[PDB]
């Protein structure tokens, strides 16, 4: 009975790591769109 | 012997879930300091 409680902690772990996994992978994709913009508009700074 | 190896790959999950949650606050702060400049330089590059 010590196992099944401890096994359940994995069962609430493996969702939460998966729950953040979509939450992280969205936010880094929000970076690299806005990352390449601030390189792109930087060339529009010294041009303007 | 099953109780041992269930504990370890629970702990490395516990190692990552502290670290991963430490990133989502951090990369949000990395986002916001980038979120200024893409709102900042855009307000320059049209006024230029």
Query: Angle formed by the axes of helices B2-47 and A2-47, to 10°?
Result: 20
Burial of B42 (0-12, 13-18, 19+ CB in 10 A): middle
A34 touches chain B (CB under 8 A): yes
The Cα B14–Cα B29 span in angstroms is 23
Which of A31, A35, A45 is facing B45, going by the closest CB pair? A45
Which of B2, B31, B44 is facing A30, going by the closest CB pair? B31
Total residue length of chain A: 48
Burial of B19 (0-12, 13-18, 19+ CB in 10 A): exposed
Mutate to test the interface with A, among B41, B46, B47 (most CBs of A within 10 A): B41
What resolution in angstroms does the PDB record give?
4.2
């Amino acid at each position: 009975e010590a196992k099944r409680k401890l096994q359940a902690r994995l069962a609430e772990a493996e969702e939460t790591i998966e729950s953040l996994n979509q939450k992280v992978i969205a936010l880094e994709k929000t970076k690299q769109r806005l990352a390449t913009e601030v390189e792109d508009l930087q060339l529009e700074v010294d041009r303007a």
